[PDB]
Design a protein around this ligand. Structure first.
Ligand SMILES: [Mg+2]
Ligand SMILES: [Mg+2]
Ligand SMILES: [Mg+2]
Lengths: 602, 543, 173, 178
């Protein structure tokens, strides 16, 4: 409900090392291609102004009662620690979004590329040799500055503790009103007049500062931090068929950072939302109706990965049995794609295996290549200022980058619940699927610039119903499969996977013998991830990537489509509740032969 | 005769070597990769077969020894008792012929076990396949069957990621997702945690000295002074260069050996691989004349990548590619196979060249060089052997280069569209052909190659650089530069204000009328003028 | 944050004692050399341009000593220093009533023939004499008192010993 | 060389630890629960002082555990409502009741180290500002410049019939100060 409104009173520059045209440095621009103040700039600037206030109230003591309050509101800075710290770092109470131009003005810009450039102008700069008084060689630059008078507004959230006394609430409001009013400048070249601003909270005024002036001598230490522990009841019904499948549509309202790995100083991003990111929202919304924590432990609940929406459905990870013509083919070209589970390599022309992306739907007489979805992503670069030199330094890292999924992307997950848990809910709330609409924050850096997503629930979809072909069984890994070897570590092998399905389905399987046709097309996967509740990284999870494929000739018995359906719901292997293990049997995209086909302001 | 063909090959090289930004680990990681199929192969062969391949390697410090019939005998015929023959050994790959399955198996065990111990985190495996010599062509079939089945058996194998698994309580590597296990030191001497993987890379950085200093006594002689020296310098350049067509040759080589006999295929196939390796090495030794301030991360086969001094990298790569063509024209063992394959007796390579300010992250700058090489490698479709079918690229060598001038962003797609200002216009001609116009004159796409010839850029740079005062003032070059970002009508308008004041501008025209800096190309308008202004100071040579 | 013993806001009126020209990127169809204007099109002194005029004069005062200048105006190189303690804002120029920007013609006279040289004709927009703008300084003192060199600077401004903008030797600034 | 391993199925963690207690004497343990990851130590009899209420599953309980000492490591993971699989891995052939014995040959075992979180802040305390404290079971006091390494052995064996070697397991041993 809170906003920050920023009125820019001189021309202002922010955010980018890159430079485009005849300008040397270019300003940060949002998804509408309009300039804006990133939420991490806004937090870092506002924190700094609150740090000055607290530093004054402490009579200049750099640690003290009032610096405790800053660490309460804005969270601790680990990596400024100078000695042994035994408590875990506190997160911030205050989340501050990015500040954007007025939405009705932003609509007027749409498509008017020449006007979006005109919001800024080149500012020249020269450096002058002190003895000769003439410009130094090399020392010439031209810089983009955005026109003064821009009025920008940011959403702010204060998720205060459920128990904070009204005296302490007035202290928090006092500091934030104080730090806002002390804030006078932001962005680049502040010390030389760029980026002068008025920063105001909605609903904080001089009354908030005046109360603090009247009362700061009375103020105590902040309350101690406490984790929100889980709480089980153990009261759930037994799981009973059927399984209800509730599609959840996720739409990114700001960039989302979903850490794949760090290489150097750049955090790389996944191109899907793992199901673990949604368990916090499932806990928020359904934990009032049934014991969500017990359901996870019993496996009565699955939230799949969210993959890019194609054909109105979740895009499916591209099967590694597809190979494209290396010269000018593949799904990116829309032609020259061979399903190597069924087609020989053509003579002469060499192929490259498919390695990523998602395909839409395909049917056993598609006459076309399946619709292929792409996920757009952007690189955001940040810095960390050392407070005494007021510039970044090696002692504080100083430069880092996030890849992020940009805004406006749409993803589809599915929550699956057994019939007995939907009965539990519906006995308590008939409209419970209405409570699944939410806006939530997921990811890395979720509390500021990144991570804002809409969730919308669809209507209950039908259970998947694969074809029970007794000739070949074919398995498409729609999600990463984690298996444990018989030593309970993850060093399982594809022969352990044969036994798993063989044992699970009551059939014997053997690799197909056709010398031109590949039978197995896996790649290894390793996931490294934190666990926030533990405060320690998860054990490393090893398995096979989504998109991996294999096909077996059935040696004896008969495969039962009833059991294939059930595995397509609950998945196979470890941690299926996070959407690992999700799998597709006998999908015709593995069965078909593809080489002949082609793709379809105010 | 009957026997087995062993293939041993190293996977994941680009991830293992180029991920970590630390110069010592990239050198160290590349060394462990080279040693795995040479030093460790020959030691592995010697421990299994009781041969002395390692002694000849370490005395000669070169692979040429395994060409010599006394030093690497035929497995076939009774005249020699040898039970092993190395068909090929090279960086990242090795192939051997063995007459017993158990020794074939034991060789692969021996080599891979040593990799697990001495080179943790290196991914290496092998395959052996039945080789039948009563088929006159079975050895060529064995090679292709071995390469085919190796991919399939890689999947049904335990990955290199299946070890060093994180426990929640174990600290992190500083440079990797792996759990820390060891300590090392920052360049400023502060202690840092590292993994066993990064520890062994950093340790092995010294072992690379002995190999490269045999290539030239100047190279990598004191690694810490290279790091110090690079920081003093103004620009670096990550160069990546890659050979064209060898893969299609070697997948089809039965067609070009002449006599359809196993012994000839081995003899030809072995010599070709060694010949390429020498051509790459010889061309590199020629190219360094343009400059010590050059670090080979990879040098071998058809493949080169080095961190050069910047503003010497266009000439080093031009000189390298020209020298590499000249080597492959003169080397007999390539000449006839290339002549039969492509109608001309030479091979070719292309290069991607980042050119970076020295502190900028290497792992990012190398990812550019991987994208620039793909653009330079587009000649492999626009210039082609006439009436070939399926159409084969004609041997042509080309460059693409960048010169970053940025602190963060580095997206080839953003980079190139931000200087493609109008839908009819692009301000770059940058995939430049370095092959001489004489060699290309009988390919399709000849006129395209001439519009893209590097000599057009190198000439234009000389005019900009030519002079007691500039022939074209910088004052005026920057007027043109600004106008190029406008519509072509406005760009031509500004040139027409100038074109008669500076008679040198007749040489920069491209219209054939001396009234536009743009020429039409594939329906687009494109110009060399902005490449010449960019590259003006990155055409320096000790010659 | 940066510790600050006292923040000094140092402000007043600056008057153009001769016509000013702070240049923009240049050219404006009306003149060859064109005045800097802020994003609202108002004429202004960029704080970069004024800050450099002040830092320049102090450097001539302190005999080009770097060591003391960097302690006021900050640095990038030294591990101890970083951001500037003196802050200089942008200041809009208010031209006198009814007055307007003047265009000054210029010519270069060939030293041999005594006549205008070919191409050496130019014109410059100038802010007329008597125009005003705000002095917009802030100083974040970490020590007590006020630096004497910063007091000498303000004395020099009141003496009118500082020149700002272009053509400083040829009438302006 | 044989790495022995013993399997038992449909066993609760409280019951698995009880069955192996003769061999898990002084064993360090690492228990995974939805809320927290706990180090524990068994006494020299091989018992956990509050074993039932610590090792129950039913209410946010432990779902996976590892127990290790010089001679062996026990692993357990849940599979249905608190019934799990026990596997005990040992360098020594040992009698275990009800456990099904097996083994696999290995070519060589190479030692490994994993650095634990943080510097020094019976039981000792490590601390790092990234994570706060970590209390670890370690009898010797720690000097201010020490580190603690968990130590292990990786077991190398042929995986492929083509003779490709790999590590077939890693066994944890003990905490060691370095
Ligand atoms: Mg320069
Ligand atoms: Mg510039
Ligand atoms: Mg003009």
């Amino acid at each position: 409900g809170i906003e920050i409104t920023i009125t820019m009173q001189s021309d202002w520059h922010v955010g980018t090392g890159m430079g485009r045209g005849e300008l040397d440095s270019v300003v940060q621009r949002d998804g509408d291609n309009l300039p804006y103040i990133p939420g991490k700039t806004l937090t870092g600037i506002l924190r700094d102004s609150c740090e000055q206030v607290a530093l004054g109230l402490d009579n200049g003591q750099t640690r003290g009662l009032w610096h405790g309050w800053i660490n309460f509101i804005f969270g601790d800075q680990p990596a400024l620690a100078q000695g042994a710290i035994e408590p875990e770092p506190r997160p911030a109470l205050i989340a501050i979004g990015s500040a954007h131009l007025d939405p009705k003005l932003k609509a007027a810009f749409q498509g008017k590329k020449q006007l979006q450039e005109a919001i800024a102008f080149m500012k020249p700069g020269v450096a002058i040799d002190a003895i000769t008084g003439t410009a130094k060689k090399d020392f010439l630059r031209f810089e983009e500055v955005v026109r003064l008078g821009a009025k920008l507004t940011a959403e702010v959230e204060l998720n205060l503790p459920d128990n904070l006394s009204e005296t302490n609430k007035k202290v928090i409001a006092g500091i934030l009103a104080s730090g806002a009013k002390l804030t006078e400048r932001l962005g680049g070249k502040r010390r030389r007049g760029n980026g002068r601003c008025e920063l105001k909270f909605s609903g904080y005024s001089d009354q908030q500062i005046q109360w603090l002036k009247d009362n700061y001598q009375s103020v105590d230490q902040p309350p101690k931090y406490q984790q929100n522990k889980l709480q089980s009841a153990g009261d759930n019904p037994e799981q009973q068929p059927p399984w209800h499948i509730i599609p959840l549509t996720i739409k990114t309202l700001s960039p989302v950072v979903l850490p794949a790995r760090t290489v150097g100083n750049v955090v790389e991003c996944l191109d899907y939302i793992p199901g673990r990111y949604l368990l916090g929202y499932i806990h928020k919304t359904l934990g009032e109706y049934f014991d969500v924590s017990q359901a996870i432990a019993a496996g009565d609940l699955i939230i799949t990965n969210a993959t890019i929406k194609i054909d109105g459905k979740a895009g499916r990870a591209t099967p590694f049995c597809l190979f494209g013509e290396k010269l000018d083919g593949g799904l990116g070209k829309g032609k020259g794609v061979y399903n190597r589970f069924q087609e020989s390599e053509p003579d002469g022309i060499q192929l490259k295996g498919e390695r990523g992306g998602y395909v839409g739907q395909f049917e056993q007489e598609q006459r076309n290549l399946p619709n292929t979805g792409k996920i757009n992503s952007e690189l955001f670069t940040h810095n960390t200022i050392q407070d005494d030199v007021q510039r970044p330094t090696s002692d504080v890292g100083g430069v880092y980058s996030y890849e992020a999924i940009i805004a406006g992307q749409t993803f589809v997950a599915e929550l699956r619940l057994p019939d007995s848990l939907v009965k539990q809910i519906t006995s308590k709330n008939k409209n419970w699927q209405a409570q699944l609409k939410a806006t939530i924050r997921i990811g890395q850096s979720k509390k500021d610039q990144y991570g804002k997503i809409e969730v919308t629930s669809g209507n209950s979809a039908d259970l998947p119903k694969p074809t029970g072909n007794n000739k070949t069984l074919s398995i498409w890994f729609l999600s990463d499969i984690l298996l444990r070897g018989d030593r309970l570590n993850f060093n399982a092998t594809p022969d352990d996977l044969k036994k798993y399905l063989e044992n699970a389905l009551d059939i014997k399987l053997k690799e197909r013998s056709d010398n031109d046709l590949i039978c197995i097309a896996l790649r290894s996967q390793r996931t490294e991830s934190w666990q926030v509740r533990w405060g320690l990284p998860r054990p490393s999870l090893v398995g096979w990537q989504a998109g991996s494929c294999l096909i077996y000739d059935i040696e004896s018995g008969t495969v039962n489509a009833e059991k294939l359906q059930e595995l397509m719901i609950t998945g196979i292997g470890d941690r299926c509740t996070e959407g690992y293990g999700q799998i597709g049997f006998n999908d015709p995209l593995l069965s078909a032969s593809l080489g002949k086909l082609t793709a379809k302001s105010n | 005769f009957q026997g087995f063909l062993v293939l041993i090959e190293t996977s994941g090289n680009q991830h293992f070597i180029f991920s970590t930004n630390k110069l010592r680990e990239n050198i160290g990681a590349s060394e462990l990769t080279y040693l795995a199929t040479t030093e460790i192969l020959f030691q592995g062969v010697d421990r299994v077969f009781q041969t002395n391949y390692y002694d000849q390697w370490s005395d000669t410090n070169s692979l040429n020894f395994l060409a010599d019939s006394k030093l690497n005998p035929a497995i076939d015929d009774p005249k020699n008792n040898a039970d092993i023959e190395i068909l090929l050994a090279t960086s990242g790959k090795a192939i051997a012929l063995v007459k017993e399955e158990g020794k074939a198996k034991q060789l692969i065990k021996e080599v891979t076990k040593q990799a697990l111990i001495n080179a943790p985190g290196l991914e290496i495996g092998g395959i052996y396949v039945n080789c039948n010599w009563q088929d006159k062509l079975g050895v060529a079939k064995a090679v292709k069957e071995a390469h085919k089945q190796f991919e399939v058996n890689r999947a049904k194998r335990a990955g290199a990621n299946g070890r060093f698994l994180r426990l929640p309580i174990a600290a992190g590597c500083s440079v990797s997702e792996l759990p820390a296990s060891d300590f090392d030191y920052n360049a400023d001497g502060d202690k840092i945690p590292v993994s066993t993987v990064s520890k062994v890379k950093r340790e092995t950085a010294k072992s690379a000295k002995k190999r490269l200093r045999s290539v030239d006594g100047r190279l990598v002689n004191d690694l810490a002074q290279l790091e110090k020296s690079f920081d003093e310098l103004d620009w670096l350049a990550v160069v990546h260069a890659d050979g064209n067509g060898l893969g299609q040759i070697l997948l089809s080589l039965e067609k070009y050996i002449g006599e359809q006999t196993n012994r000839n295929y081995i003899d030809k196939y072995r010599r070709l691989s060694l010949a390429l390796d020498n051509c790459t090495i010889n061309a590199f030794k020629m190219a360094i004349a343009v400059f010590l301030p050059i670090v080979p991360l990879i040098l071998g086969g058809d493949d080169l990548t080095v961190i050069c001094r910047g503003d010497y990298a266009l000439e080093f790569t031009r000189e390298f590619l020209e020298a590499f063509e000249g080597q492959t024209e003169t080397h007999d063992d390539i000449k006839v196979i290339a002549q039969k394959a492509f109608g001309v007796d030479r091979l070719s390579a292309c290069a991607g060249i980042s050119i970076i300010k020295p502190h900028f992250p290497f792992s990012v700058a190398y990812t550019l060089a991987e994208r620039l090489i793909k653009s330079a490698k587009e000649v492999k479709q626009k210039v082609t052997v006439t009436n070939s079918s399926p159409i084969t690229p004609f041997p042509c060598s080309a460059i693409d280069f960048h010169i970053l001038y940025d602190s963060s962003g580095i997206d080839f797609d953003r980079i190139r569209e931000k200087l493609r200002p109008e839908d009819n216009t692009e301000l770059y001609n940058r995939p430049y052909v370095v092959t001489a116009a004489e060699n290309l004159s009988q390919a399709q796409g000849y006129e395209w190659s001439q519009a893209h010839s590097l000599q057009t850029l190198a000439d234009r740079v000389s005019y900009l650089r030519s002079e007691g005062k500039s022939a074209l003032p910088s004052s005026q070059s920057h007027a043109l530069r600004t106008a190029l970002y406008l519509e072509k009508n406005e760009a031509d308008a500004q040139y027409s204000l100038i074109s008669q004041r500076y008679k040198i501008l007749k040489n920069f025209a491209e219209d054939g009328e001396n009234k536009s800096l743009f020429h039409l190309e594939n329906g687009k308008y494109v110009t060399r003028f902005l490449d010449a202004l960019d590259a003006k100071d990155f055409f320096a040579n000790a010659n | 944050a940066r510790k600050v013993t006292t923040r000094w806001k140092i402000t007043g009126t600056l008057i153009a004692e001769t016509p000013l020209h702070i240049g923009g990127v240049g050219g404006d169809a009306d003149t060859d050399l064109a005045l800097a204007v802020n994003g609202a099109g108002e004429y202004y002194v960029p704080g970069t341009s004024l800050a450099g005029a002040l830092r320049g004069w102090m450097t001539q005062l302190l005999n080009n000593d770097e060591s003391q200048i960097k302690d006021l105006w900050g640095d990038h190189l030294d591990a101890k220093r970083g951001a500037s303690f003196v802050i200089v804002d942008d200041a809009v120029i208010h031209i006198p009533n009814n007055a307007d920007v003047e265009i000054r013609e210029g010519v270069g006279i060939d030293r041999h023939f005594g006549t205008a040289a070919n191409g050496f004709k130019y014109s410059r927009a100038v802010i007329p004499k008597g125009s005003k703008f705000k002095l917009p300084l802030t100083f974040d003192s970490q020590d007590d008192g006020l630096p004497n060199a910063l007091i000498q600077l303000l004395c020099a401004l009141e003496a009118g010993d500082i020149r700002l903008g272009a053509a400083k030797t040829r009438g302006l600034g | 060389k044989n790495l022995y391993h013993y399997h038992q199925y449909e066993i609760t963690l409280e019951s698995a630890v009880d069955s192996c207690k003769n061999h898990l004497q002084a064993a360090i343990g690492l228990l995974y629960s939805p809320q927290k990851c706990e180090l524990v130590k068994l006494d020299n009899s091989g018992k956990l002082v509050d074993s039932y209420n610590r090792l129950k599953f039913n209410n946010l309980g432990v779902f996976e555990a590892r127990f290790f000492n010089l001679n062996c490591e026990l692993r357990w993971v849940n599979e249905s409502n608190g019934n799990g699989t026990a596997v005990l891995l040992s360098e020594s052939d040992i009698t275990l009741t009800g456990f099904e014995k097996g083994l696999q040959e290995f070519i060589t075992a190479i030692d490994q180290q994993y650095l634990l979180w943080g510097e020094p802040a019976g039981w000792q305390r490590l601390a790092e500002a990234r994570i706060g404290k970590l209390d670890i079971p370690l009898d010797n006091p720690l000097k201010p410049k020490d580190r603690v390494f968990l130590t292990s052995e990786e077991y190398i064996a042929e995986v492929d019939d083509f003779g490709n070697c790999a590590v077939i397991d890693e066994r944890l041993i003990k905490l060691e100060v370095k």
